[PDB]
Design a protein around this motif. Structure first.
Motif, PDB file in Angstrom:
ATOM      1  N   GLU A  68       3.584  12.609   3.343  1.00 13.91           N
ATOM      2  CA  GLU A  68       3.436  12.235   4.685  1.00 13.91           C
ATOM      3  C   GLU A  68       1.955  12.191   5.217  1.00 13.91           C
ATOM      4  O   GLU A  68       1.734  11.234   6.111  1.00 13.91           O
ATOM      5  CB  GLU A  68       3.812  13.575   5.770  1.00 13.91           C
ATOM      6  N   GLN A  85      -6.748  13.116   4.848  1.00 16.48           N
ATOM      7  CA  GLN A  85      -6.365  13.475   6.248  1.00 16.48           C
ATOM      8  C   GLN A  85      -5.941  15.199   5.952  1.00 16.48           C
ATOM      9  O   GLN A  85      -6.191  15.878   7.004  1.00 16.48           O
ATOM     10  CB  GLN A  85      -4.936  13.036   6.236  1.00 16.48           C
ATOM     11  N   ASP A  89      -3.885  10.813  -3.118  1.00 16.26           N
ATOM     12  CA  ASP A  89      -5.423  11.024  -3.473  1.00 16.26           C
ATOM     13  C   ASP A  89      -6.254   9.926  -2.921  1.00 16.26           C
ATOM     14  O   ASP A  89      -6.375   8.849  -3.842  1.00 16.26           O
ATOM     15  CB  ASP A  89      -5.711  11.414  -4.664  1.00 16.26           C
ATOM     16  N   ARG A 149     -11.496   9.944  -6.163  1.00 19.69           N
ATOM     17  CA  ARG A 149      -9.984   9.842  -6.843  1.00 19.69           C
ATOM     18  C   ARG A 149      -9.762   9.365  -8.135  1.00 19.69           C
ATOM     19  O   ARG A 149      -8.860   9.803  -8.790  1.00 19.69           O
ATOM     20  CB  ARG A 149      -9.048   8.884  -5.898  1.00 19.69           C
ATOM     21  N   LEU A 208      -1.516   2.253   0.714  1.00 19.42           N
ATOM     22  CA  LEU A 208      -1.011   3.398   1.441  1.00 19.42           C
ATOM     23  C   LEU A 208      -0.035   4.348   0.356  1.00 19.42           C
ATOM     24  O   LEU A 208       0.461   5.423   0.569  1.00 19.42           O
ATOM     25  CB  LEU A 208       0.105   3.022   2.316  1.00 19.42           C
ATOM     26  N   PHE A 209       0.480   3.845  -0.799  1.00 18.82           N
ATOM     27  CA  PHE A 209       1.452   4.565  -1.707  1.00 18.82           C
ATOM     28  C   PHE A 209       0.708   4.609  -2.826  1.00 18.82           C
ATOM     29  O   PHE A 209       1.345   5.741  -3.553  1.00 18.82           O
ATOM     30  CB  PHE A 209       2.679   3.669  -1.870  1.00 18.82           C
ATOM     31  N   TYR A 210      -0.390   4.225  -3.358  1.00 19.82           N
ATOM     32  CA  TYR A 210      -1.292   4.344  -4.548  1.00 19.82           C
ATOM     33  C   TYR A 210      -2.465   4.262  -4.289  1.00 19.82           C
ATOM     34  O   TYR A 210      -3.379   3.619  -5.222  1.00 19.82           O
ATOM     35  CB  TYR A 210      -0.574   3.625  -5.739  1.00 19.82           C
ATOM     36  N   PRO A 211      -3.341   5.106  -3.390  1.00 12.50           N
ATOM     37  CA  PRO A 211      -4.642   5.042  -3.137  1.00 12.50           C
ATOM     38  C   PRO A 211      -5.283   5.189  -4.409  1.00 12.50           C
ATOM     39  O   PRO A 211      -6.463   4.829  -4.698  1.00 12.50           O
ATOM     40  CB  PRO A 211      -4.721   5.867  -2.222  1.00 12.50           C
ATOM     41  N   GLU A 212      -4.949   6.160  -5.437  1.00  6.74           N
ATOM     42  CA  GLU A 212      -5.701   6.683  -6.564  1.00  6.74           C
ATOM     43  C   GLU A 212      -5.736   5.374  -7.304  1.00  6.74           C
ATOM     44  O   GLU A 212      -6.851   5.387  -8.145  1.00  6.74           O
ATOM     45  CB  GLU A 212      -5.173   7.833  -7.237  1.00  6.74           C
ATOM     46  N   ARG A 213      -5.040   4.546  -7.428  1.00  7.31           N
ATOM     47  CA  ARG A 213      -5.131   3.275  -8.214  1.00  7.31           C
ATOM     48  C   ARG A 213      -5.788   2.061  -7.707  1.00  7.31           C
ATOM     49  O   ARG A 213      -5.909   1.022  -8.300  1.00  7.31           O
ATOM     50  CB  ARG A 213      -3.502   2.766  -8.593  1.00  7.31           C
ATOM     51  N   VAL A 214      -6.415   2.104  -6.362  1.00  7.69           N
ATOM     52  CA  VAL A 214      -6.779   1.053  -5.694  1.00  7.69           C
ATOM     53  C   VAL A 214      -8.219   1.335  -5.451  1.00  7.69           C
ATOM     54  O   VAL A 214      -8.603   2.391  -4.377  1.00  7.69           O
ATOM     55  CB  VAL A 214      -6.098   0.731  -4.333  1.00  7.69           C
ATOM     56  N   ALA A 260     -10.552  -0.533  -3.763  1.00 14.46           N
ATOM     57  CA  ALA A 260     -10.782  -1.022  -2.747  1.00 14.46           C
ATOM     58  C   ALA A 260      -9.525  -2.076  -2.403  1.00 14.46           C
ATOM     59  O   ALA A 260      -8.931  -2.725  -3.207  1.00 14.46           O
ATOM     60  CB  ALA A 260     -12.248  -1.845  -2.340  1.00 14.46           C
ATOM     61  N   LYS A 314       8.063   5.898   5.711  1.00 14.88           N
ATOM     62  CA  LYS A 314       7.738   7.121   4.887  1.00 14.88           C
ATOM     63  C   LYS A 314       6.282   7.008   5.187  1.00 14.88           C
ATOM     64  O   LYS A 314       5.751   8.317   4.770  1.00 14.88           O
ATOM     65  CB  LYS A 314       8.081   7.031   3.442  1.00 14.88           C
ATOM     66  N   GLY A 333       2.724   8.621   8.924  1.00 13.75           N
ATOM     67  CA  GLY A 333       1.637   9.901   9.165  1.00 13.75           C
ATOM     68  C   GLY A 333       0.518   9.484   8.547  1.00 13.75           C
ATOM     69  O   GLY A 333      -0.780  10.019   8.792  1.00 13.75           O
ATOM     70  N   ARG A 334       0.181   8.552   7.423  1.00  6.06           N
ATOM     71  CA  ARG A 334      -0.929   8.187   6.750  1.00  6.06           C
ATOM     72  C   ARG A 334      -1.688   7.369   7.226  1.00  6.06           C
ATOM     73  O   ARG A 334      -1.528   6.591   8.258  1.00  6.06           O
ATOM     74  CB  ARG A 334      -0.563   7.702   5.341  1.00  6.06           C
ATOM     75  N   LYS A 335      -3.053   7.159   6.883  1.00  3.71           N
ATOM     76  CA  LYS A 335      -4.129   6.233   7.318  1.00  3.71           C
ATOM     77  C   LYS A 335      -4.580   5.796   5.908  1.00  3.71           C
ATOM     78  O   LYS A 335      -4.251   6.361   5.050  1.00  3.71           O
ATOM     79  CB  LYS A 335      -5.095   6.816   8.119  1.00  3.71           C
ATOM     80  N   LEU A 379      -7.785   5.037   3.945  1.00  8.49           N
ATOM     81  CA  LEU A 379      -8.877   5.671   4.403  1.00  8.49           C
ATOM     82  C   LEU A 379      -9.885   5.048   3.177  1.00  8.49           C
ATOM     83  O   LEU A 379     -11.035   5.690   2.948  1.00  8.49           O
ATOM     84  CB  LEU A 379      -9.161   7.184   4.479  1.00  8.49           C
ATOM     85  N   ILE A 380      -9.486   4.342   2.118  1.00  7.84           N
ATOM     86  CA  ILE A 380     -10.332   3.783   1.160  1.00  7.84           C
ATOM     87  C   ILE A 380     -10.733   2.487   1.454  1.00  7.84           C
ATOM     88  O   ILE A 380     -10.502   1.945   2.506  1.00  7.84           O
ATOM     89  CB  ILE A 380      -9.410   3.671  -0.360  1.00  7.84           C
ATOM     90  N   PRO A 381     -11.872   1.979   0.822  1.00  6.95           N
ATOM     91  CA  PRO A 381     -12.529   0.820   1.381  1.00  6.95           C
ATOM     92  C   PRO A 381     -11.434  -0.335   1.616  1.00  6.95           C
ATOM     93  O   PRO A 381     -10.748  -0.522   0.715  1.00  6.95           O
ATOM     94  CB  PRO A 381     -13.790   0.403   0.276  1.00  6.95           C
TER      95      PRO A 381
END
Ligand SMILES: N#Cc1cccnc1N1CCNCC1
Ligand SMILES: N#Cc1cccnc1N1CCNCC1
Ligand SMILES: [Mg+2]
Ligand SMILES: [Mg+2]
Lengths: 546, 546
Positions: free
Chosen positions: A56, A61, A127, A132, B345-351, B353, B477, B480-482, B484-486
């Motif tokens: 979520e 966050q 993450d 990350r 949003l779903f895979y920030p660890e993989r992105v 930027a 889903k 709730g997230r934001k 926050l990666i570049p």
């Protein structure tokens, strides 16, 4: 009866566990015992942490929420947090501390090898930290070894909620009693037990594997040292570059970092690098494993001169140009070995570092015709046999299975000697119709080779041997130069053609030449001693090409 | 009459020239005027430098020879060299100082565009210095723009020996009077003149181009600003990854450095990135330009759900896994734009930027069915028209040339409005049979697109629009997230569908969002304003992803 094995990440497949750094940090900073775990767990099913584990909210966050929780926990315990107490810091450090628990991975591997469906079931988070990538790499290194990875933050459910175990069973397509589930946290095992799963409470690894061994009846502890990870051809990224009108080169590509171009020998394939490809990628390099001109999915023009070193080198240069690579590390074996030395002498600006397995660098002799040089070494006799177009093609193509099964042999298994081949009338005249399988290769692996050689046969590969004079002339142009870029020579004790002693003068041409040596290793270096090869290349890459 | 143009590197295509640093160093260090050029030239045709230029010795071998020469030169001039005088240093510095002379490159480009055969003819050396990569990059950036590169050290001959000019003419397949040859060194022009070549003595660039303009009758000076380099499809490395049994993804790949994954929109192609691909590679990135699922050489399964964002994202993740990439920078446009926000949003660890051109990030509204949201914006009407399987396929496939020629238009040329498409009965009901060609695209370029869409047509591409509900549910889903990666959002002033104002709340979800904006730019961003796009992406990559 058991058909599936499920492992947790934190505290089972990777160690130290992160909850562990809550405990250690408390101790280190002399905080009230449990203060950090209370803050971590605050609100339970509706608290910040559960929302994190459910996907979520993202990690970043969550961080300030856990801060608040810690403040609240310390107020109620009537204590103060240290100046500069920092959850970001604590978590960054804990997350980079955790490493793969190798014996647990190795047990999972073995279980998958005897046909288990394996899975990772983990409570984890989205993450988004600046750091990350570290976790992304770990999950990458782990996920490849498993049939499924189920992540609480992706499926919206968490251990110990019972719905995730149902989701688990459903992903496994197994009934609960066919499943062993391992976890470091007792509460998380409970719902698995309720369904009648075999569970293992993992405290120390070795005891958990003993339980796992008993209950599956497969040996997991004290097992001999496994081979490195191999490549499955149809999971590779396959790349194609047209370097000139009739000529396109295929390669397989894995990893990121400095580009490392692997050049196979005769009569082989990118697949000859299958044990080094994941290891070097894992070690932080961008591996490009070629099919060299002549082979596999690369073009195979018929004309002899299409395969002299000069054309072959220029072509490899063009290949870098078209990929936009100003350099690559060149590593070669056998014929590829000879080719990379020439890349070093004619295109040093394009070669980051050069390494050869087995193939020594020997300057051309400007006083002796190459043919003569070759007739003065009984073990090179096989090369004269390759001269006459058609002859060796007919023998090599007659029975592809038999060819590779006769060639690919470890030093203690050999059926063909390279000795008096012309006289005997051929390479296999005194070897069986159906050789036994080398320990170095499975039947599946031989058939991959067989299938690749059905596209072009042996004309292109054999042509590599058919430019003695033309290579000699071009090589003579290089007799004033030395190789002054980083360079590694790896000799193979039991290669009876490219013997170690043939490399013994190389320091005259390559004064800062570095060496490795592999004992009890025949001519097929990468597949004979894959572990030693990987270890020797990565150490050399890391110090000389990095 | 003139058909060919030949340029030198040092002092013609790259500046400052290195001989120039011999002069400057003399001055800087107050040495006898010419002392360094005397040492450089010592022994003339048999001296160290000629052997270097001929490829007999490498640069590092030459360095100590030039040292000796300098010592000898200073002894005979009865002077002392400075403490720590260092040829290695002087040359390292000079070689990294030299940069491409852009107006000369641009003149060569233009001449090649009006059909000249262009070549680089240069006295240069085999470079084995620790710092050689710098020169390797320059030659890479230069050689791609020319028909031939002739290097003294590769051909064994040097200017001004007459044999190299013969070799030149022979490589050009031209007679001497069809050739203009430019050089900063008079002696080197002489033999070209003797053969009746037009020669230009290059002192300052602009005067040399004036001479070159007069003599060829082509405008070279004061020419309008050219487009960035484009990609020729059959010079690209083409890559293929199977991400699941029926699904393989194609991409084109250029450059080294952090991985940057380019995701095109509807109904487009990797080729839509043709202006950014060389620029980003040149800027130090590893560009992977996809054919997104549905298109070109990627698979195109027929089922609608094969194209919901969720499946599409998971697939892109698998694509990284199989390439061994723990992250990539994701850049998207239009549909690819929407997809990269979801990757974030779903895979920030993989992105690493994320950046979008045109496509804003807008959260799903959990209170309004997506269909309703869509019916509340007259300019999204075209999306309802795409809903009914078959309808838009029939119109789009009927005449591929006409389709792309009608879609691909700059903001001041348009024939189709996206307005009341359903009512009108189609996308092209009020546009011509044979539209004129946009200024943005050649006929060749339209035909590339036409040819790609002959493999799968429009079913897969249109399916991207057919998962409104399914995407909406998955997107909820993430409420709730934001992010926050570049993150960079690039708006296009004159995109009348993805208008700038639609992006105006994005900072609520992406607080450190960075922006760029392009004026007078329609929906087809990359090809409308390729120069501005490149400039905006490279600046953002360099500061946020590097
Ligand atoms: N054929 C072959 C062969 C067979 C056994 C050992 N070594 C071999 N060769 C491979 C080619 N290069 C020279 C050595
Ligand atoms: N079709 C289309 C089209 C035509 C002109 C301008 N924009 C367009 N589209 C491309 C698809 N995404 C939304 C905008
Ligand atoms: Mg745990
Ligand atoms: Mg010059």
């Amino acid at each position: 009866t058991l058909r599936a094995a499920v492992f947790d990440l934190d505290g089972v497949l990777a160690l130290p566990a992160v909850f562990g750094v809550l405990g250690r940090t408390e101790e280190a900073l002399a905080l009230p015992r449990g203060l950090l775990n209370d803050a971590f767990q605050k609100g339970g099913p509706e608290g910040a942490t559960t929302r994190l584990m459910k996907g979520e909210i993202t990690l970043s966050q969550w961080i300030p929420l856990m801060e608040e929780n810690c403040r609240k926990c310390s107020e109620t315990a009537k204590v103060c947090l240290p100046k500069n107490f920092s959850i970001k810091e604590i978590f960054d450090k804990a997350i980079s501390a955790r490493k793969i628990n190798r014996p647990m991975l190795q047990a999972a591997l073995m279980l998958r090898k005897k046909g288990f469906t394996t899975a990772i079931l983990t409570n984890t988070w989205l993450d988004d930290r600046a750091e990350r990538d570290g976790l992304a790499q770990l999950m990458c290194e782990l996920k490849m070894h498993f049939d499924f990875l189920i992540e609480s933050c992706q499926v919206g459910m968490v251990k110990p909620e019972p719905q995730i175990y149902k989701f688990l069973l459903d992903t496994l397509k197994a009934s609960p009693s066919e499943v062993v589930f391992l976890d470091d946290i007792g509460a998380n095992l409970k719902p698995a037990r309720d369904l009648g799963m075999v569970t293992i409470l993992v405290q120390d690894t070795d005891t958990a594997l003993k339980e796992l061994e008993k209950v599956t009846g497969i040996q997991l502890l004290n097992t001999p040292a496994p081979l490195p990870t191999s490549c499955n051809p149809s999971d590779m990224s396959h790349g194609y570059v047209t370097v000139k009108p009739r000529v396109r080169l295929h390669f397989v590509e894995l990893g990121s970092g400095p580009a490392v171009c692997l050049c196979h020998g005769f009569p082989e394939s990118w697949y000859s690098w299958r044990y080094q490809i994941p290891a070097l990628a894992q070690a932080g390099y961008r591996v490009l494993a070629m099919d060299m001109k002549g082979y596999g999915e690369s073009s195979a023009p018929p004309e002899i001169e299409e395969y002299c070193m000069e054309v072959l080198c220029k072509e490899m240069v063009t290949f870098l140009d078209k990929l936009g690579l100003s350099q690559a590390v060149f590593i070669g074996h056998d014929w590829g070995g000879m080719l990379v030395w020439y890349m070093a002498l004619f295109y040093p600006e394009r070669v980051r570092a050069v390494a050869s397995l087995n193939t020594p660098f020997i300057p051309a002799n400007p006083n002796m015709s190459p043919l003569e040089s070759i007739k003065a070494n009984p073990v090179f006799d096989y090369q004269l046999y390759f001269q006459e177009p058609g002859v060796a093609e007919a023998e090599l193509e007659q029975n592809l299975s038999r060819t590779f099964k006769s060639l690919f042999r470890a030093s203690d298994e050999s059926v063909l000697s390279m000795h008096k081949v012309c006289e005997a009338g051929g390479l296999f005249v005194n070897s069986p119709e159906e050789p036994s399988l080398s320990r170095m290769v499975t039947e599946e692996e031989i058939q991959f080779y067989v299938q690749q050689f059905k596209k072009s046969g042996f004309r292109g590969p054999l042509n590599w041997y058919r430019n003695m004079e033309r290579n000699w002339k071009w090589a003579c142009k290089s007799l004033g130069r030395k190789i002054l870029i980083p360079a590694l020579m790896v000799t193979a004790e039991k290669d009876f053609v490219l013997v170690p002693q043939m490399s013994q003068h190389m320091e005259d041409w390559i004064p800062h030449l570095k060496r490795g040596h592999i004992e009890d290793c025949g001519h097929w270096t990468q597949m004979d001693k894959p572990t030693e090869v990987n270890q020797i290349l990565i150490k050399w890459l890391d110090s000389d090409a990095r």
